[PDB]
Design a protein around this ligand. Structure first.
Ligand SMILES: C[S@@+](CC[C@H](N)C(=O)[O-])C[C@H]1O[C@@H](n2cnc3c(N)ncnc32)[C@H](O)[C@@H]1O
Ligand SMILES: C[S@@+](CC[C@H](N)C(=O)[O-])C[C@H]1O[C@@H](n2cnc3c(N)ncnc32)[C@H](O)[C@@H]1O
Ligand code: SF4
Ligand code: SF4
Ligand code: SF4
Ligand code: SF4
Lengths: 323, 317
């Protein structure tokens, strides 16, 4: 009462628990593998989760990696910290644990009792050498006993690997499951292990009309930085929200809401930045591609270096003085 | 409760004649409410202070696009959100796709569901679906879904491959058949997936009520294909207000018992009285809506539960 909308982006948060994974996908934006060492400390993650659970605005806490079910003991401990505070939880997994019917029974029982409202399973031709089809089927079939857990199947595809046979092999286990096939973002292992010809190109620089950011969503990443979104493309940029080791979530939200570059991006769209480079003939100097698989790819190539961000500084400063 | 969303089924007429159609829709379908009556309904829903979302279904709502746009423009000054479902026949022309997306975006259409599968395929070509899906990328505020109705013999595997990269970023859901309408007589029951049985207690719960003003002139408590073959209606008179429809839904004893006790309350009565075979309750079913449809698809069946529901009312409340 007597207050209008304050800060945005404070209802959800994501934590990337670790870069370690059982799989070594050739497209992995983080080049994840069993030998990946990039991660925040366990006690630091416990403090973060405790703070997010006690926070009055956060409604949803999401966990990602890496493979979050790889160290299940630690994942269940984090979920039990949240439990007395009744926050909703979302999980994403490669479903390696589907190989064991005992783990399938136990994990669904735990997710249901720990307020896990959504589980996304990632399966495609890039994941297929590391996880069997029957493991995915066991998870999808058992999810029918837990209708309150929203189940999704995310498939990362290329022109040569469209996952048509993968989806057929899953049989009727996909009935009622939301399936989304998405193109690659040229970051991490996809940059060097996938032919760029095989990456779908849906956007071009000439269609600035439809180039707007899908929306911010705070991520506390395994590199110890904080990002304004969960897109694979953002982790390659110099856009971070961390100023110190012990930063509060209220401070992260305040920084996101006062960041001038991100305010201009949300309000004016990508055309504001692209027209500044076109007007000053800098598209070739900054090696900005002409075609992209996603709007995030444009974002990635506009701010993936300090030279590029610093270039926009006088224009953003001029925008601030005018408005 | 249940007063934030409402659906209107505009007509049973369709350009398609799908073999699974829950309404047996076709170009020669004559069941519909009058246009002026629909205008009055839409005006009342637009002026209503609680309704946030108005959905349109059929039949094929884009078949008479002039009337659909007219209804959307009645809603426009009141700023309600709109959802649409279509077979995408209009996708044949990219210029027509550009026009309809421009209108949907300016008329607060927040979601568009496209239905395409092997049952829809003889009536709509693949390229028409692709044109709609590709152009939807320019309108990220419109939530795009592809819904595919499948059977064991028609799983839509080749249909999805033929769509190529037009499905990238689109939520796809394959769902089984409900044995109603044309699916009852044109599809072999062995081809209908059976996921649940009378013994799976965690599945015997209604997914939730959602008010539908249907093309038969009745009002239903949900949008499931199964409810339209039941005698569960919320209409008591021709000129009934939405406040009254909501009041009737919230005071309906059968629907209160169903939501609170689940389907096991009704099924145990029939098992205890040896009426499972008399009522033709299926042992196995593709979804819980299949049980709902078989419990309540006749006045005799509904009236059978009355003394038990009356006893429940006296014991509780
Ligand atoms: C990095 S994984 C982490 C969680 C878990 N290991 C999994 O695969 O679901 C998150 C999602 O991003 C997708 N992904 C990975 N690298 C990507 C890339 N270069 N471009 C687009 N999506 C990518 C994965 O396929 C997966 O669906
Ligand atoms: C009756 S249609 C009306 C809207 C539009 N003509 C369309 O096909 O999307 C609504 C949805 O119900 C589905 N449907 C029709 N008959 C069905 C049945 N017997 N069982 C399950 N779904 C059915 C259709 O495939 C479609 O996705
Ligand atoms: S995409 Fe997921 S499963 Fe594959 S390597 Fe990366 S983190 Fe592991
Ligand atoms: S456009 Fe940029 S900021 Fe927005 S979601 Fe994509 S990568 Fe993140
Ligand atoms: S399922 Fe939709 S397109 Fe097919 S006949 Fe029925 S109303 Fe028409
Ligand atoms: S269970 Fe019955 S009332 Fe509930 S959605 Fe299905 S048909 Fe409608």
């Amino acid at each position: 009462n007597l207050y209008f909308q304050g800060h945005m982006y404070n209802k959800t948060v994501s934590i990337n628990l670790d870069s370690r994974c059982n799989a070594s996908c050739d497209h992995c934006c983080f080049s994840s593998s069993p030998t990946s060492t990039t991660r925040m400390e366990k006690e630091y993650i416990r403090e973060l989760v405790t703070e997010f659970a006690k926070n009055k605005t956060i409604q949803v806490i999401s966990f990602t990696g890496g493979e979050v079910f790889l160290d299940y003991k630690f994942l269940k401990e984090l979920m039990e910290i949240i439990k007395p505070y009744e926050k909703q939880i979302t999980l994403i997994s490669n479903g390696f644990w589907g190989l064991s019917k005992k783990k399938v029974q136990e994990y669904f029982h735990d997710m249901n009792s720990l307020n896990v409202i959504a589980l996304t399973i990632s399966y495609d031709e890039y994941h297929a050498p590391f996880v069997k089809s029957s493991s995915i089927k066991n998870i999808l079939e058992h999810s029918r006993k837990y209708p309150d857990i929203d189940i999704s199947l995310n498939m990362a595809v290329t022109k040569d690997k469209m996952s048509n046979h993968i989806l057929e092999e899953l049989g009727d286990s996909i009935l009622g499951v939301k399936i989304t096939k998405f193109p690659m973002i040229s970051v991490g292992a996809a940059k060097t292990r996938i032919k760029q010809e095989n990456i779908h190109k849906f956007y071009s620089l000439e269609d600035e009309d439809s180039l707007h950011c899908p929306g911010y969503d705070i991520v506390y990443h395994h590199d110890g930085e904080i990002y304004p979104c969960a897109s694979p493309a953002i982790f390659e940029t110099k856009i971070t929200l961390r100023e110190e080791y012990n930063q509060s979530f209220e401070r992260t939200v305040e920084k996101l809401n006062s960041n001038l570059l991100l305010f201009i991006l949300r309000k004016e769209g990508f055309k504001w930045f692209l027209n500044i480079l076109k007007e000053n003939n800098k598209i070739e100097e900054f090696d900005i591609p002409y075609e992209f698989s996603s709007i995030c790819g444009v974002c990635g190539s506009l701010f993936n270096s300090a030279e590029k961000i610093n270039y926009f500084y006088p224009y953003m400063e001029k925008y601030y003085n005018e408005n």
